[PDB]
Amino acid sequence: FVEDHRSECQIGNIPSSVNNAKLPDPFMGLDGKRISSKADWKCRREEIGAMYEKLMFGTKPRNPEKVEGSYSGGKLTIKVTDKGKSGSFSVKISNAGDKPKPAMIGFGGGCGSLGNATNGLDIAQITFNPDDVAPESGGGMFFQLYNQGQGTIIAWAWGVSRIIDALEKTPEAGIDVKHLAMTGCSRWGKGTLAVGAFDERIALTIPQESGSGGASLWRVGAQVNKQKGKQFVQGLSSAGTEGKWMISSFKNYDGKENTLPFDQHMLVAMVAPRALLILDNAGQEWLGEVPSNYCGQASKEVYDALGATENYTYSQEGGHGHCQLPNGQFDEVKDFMNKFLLGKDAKTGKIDYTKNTQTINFKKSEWIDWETPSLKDP
Ligand SMILES: [Zn+2]
Ligand SMILES: [Zn+2]
């Protein structure tokens, strides 16, 4: 039970430019060799994260000197010691536990945007206000401790990682750290994806309407915008500027998405093989209906290769308001939370899109020219 295995893996050269109008291969090691075993994924996963930290998010500070947790009055207060100073933040908690309880962590300050989809599930709720660590205006407690030009998203992933640190040594909070989910919508759907991708202790990642910078293909977004003759979908530059989410260099890819050494199917692949339920909308122009769908479809290759097809679902339902989840997706939320948080079996693993407003025609031959290997068991 571990945040990541980065220190167990040798990270080689990270190029910042390629020439590839197709999706980059996620099974291609930095050492130039394709992986063949499921055991090779431990380190291949770290190599992808290191690429995102170098190229898009910024470096995730690791191994903090000390994390202290205290639980009082339904609020968990986390004090982090690092780099000569201290930084503190607190999260609200609902439900409790001698008898620890599985928990959903949600951006807020509401706790995420799943609404009544969780009603009837005896799980705890932890609200994380990302402004406590890194407001989109800049500044924040994170940047009191650190100063390597990171963006705000990786500061939120750091934040949630420190919540889990404090939880592991605060049993009076009454939370089962072995059964934790993460969720959030829109800007906090981009935040949720990165959170679950960069902390392996998140057992269920539920990014909602995460859009550009989230689970949406940079190359497909740029294609759609060329087909429309205008910025129909939120483009790379805009996602690389808004909210200080990304490092300042990332927006320089904007006219040249084919030079990206990655695409967002590889961020999704950082969550594998842990459970991942992507809740998407449709008919939202800026959100990117087609590039999000195509990211959803393309990302299945890594989960299939690891033999974890049952742990990944992309669910797109349009025809409803932004971040207001329709009842047609309540069954998804309940099935995954029962399965991966509460130990109750359910049929999971699906690629489903309905109530679209654009033509959905994902042809693997256009976007994927690498074979999906058969990763062997050791
Ligand atoms: Zn690992
Ligand atoms: Zn459903």
Author numbering: 155 to 251, 254 to 265, 270 to 538
Original paper wording:
Glucuronoyl esterases (GEs) within the carbohydrate esterase family 15 (CE15) esterase family, in a range of aerobic and anaerobic fungi and bacteria, have been identified as playing an important role in breaking down LCCs by cleaving the ester bond between 4-O-methyl-d-glucuronyl in xylan and alcohol groups in lignin. GEs share an invariant Ser-His-Glu/Asp catalytic triad and employ a conserved catalytic mechanism that involves the formation of an acyl-enzyme covalent intermediate, which is subsequently cleaved through acid-base hydrolysis. Rumen GEs adopt a canonical α/β hydrolase fold: FsCE15, PrCE15, and RfCE15 adopted the canonical α/β-hydrolase fold that is seen in all of the GE structures solved to date. The fold of all three enzymes consists of a central twisted 10 stranded mixed β-sheet flanked by α-helices on either side.
Crystals of FsCE15 belonged to space group P41212 with a single protein molecule in the asymmetric unit. The structure of FsCE15 was refined to Rwork/Rfree of 22.8%/28.5% (respectively) using data to a maximum resolution of 1.93 Å. The putative catalytic nucleophile, general base, and general acid of FsCE15 are Ser346, His482, and Glu369, respectively. The catalytic residues of FsCE15 and PrCE15 are positioned in the canonical conformation characteristic of CE15-B subfamily with the general acid located on a loop at the end of β7. FsCE15 and PrCE15 have a conserved disulfide bond between residues Cys345 - Cys483 and Cys225 - Cys356, respectively, which anchors the general base within optimal hydrogen bonding distance (2.7 Å) to the catalytic serine. Similarly, the addition of a reducing agent lowered the Tm of FsCE15 by 11.5 °C. These results demonstrates the important role that the disulfide bond in the active site of CE15-B GEs plays in stabilizing tertiary structure. FsCE15 has a broad pH profile with maximal activity at pH 8.0. Interestingly, HGT events between Fibrobacterota and AGF were one of the most commonly observed events by Murphey at al.. This observation is supported by our phylogenetic analysis showing that FsCE15 clustered closely with Neocallimastigomycota carbohydrate esterase family 15 esterases. FsCE15 also possesses structural features that are typically observed in fungal GEs including: a shallow active site lacking any of the insertions in the Reg1-Reg3 regions, catalytic residues that adopt a canonical CE15-A active site conformation, and a conserved disulfide bond in the active site. FsCE15 is therefore unique amongst bacterial GEs characterized to date and may represent an intermediate between fungal and bacterial GEs.
